[PDB]
């Protein structure tokens, strides 16, 4: 499951999922997950 190209491939995988759990955060689901 290592790769020499994951550190990095990785870094645009969690950007993208900052939009993602902030969306939620908004309140479309509240402190319930």
């Given at each position: 499951?290592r790769c020499?190209?994951?550190?990095?491939?990785?870094?645009?995988?969690?950007?993208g999922?900052?939009?993602?759990?902030?969306?939620?955060?908004?309140?479309?689901?509240?402190?319930?997950?």
């Amino acid at each position: 499951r290592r790769c020499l190209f994951l550190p990095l491939f990785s870094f645009l995988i969690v950007a993208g999922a900052t939009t993602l759990f902030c969306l939620l955060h908004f309140g479309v689901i509240g402190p319930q997950r």
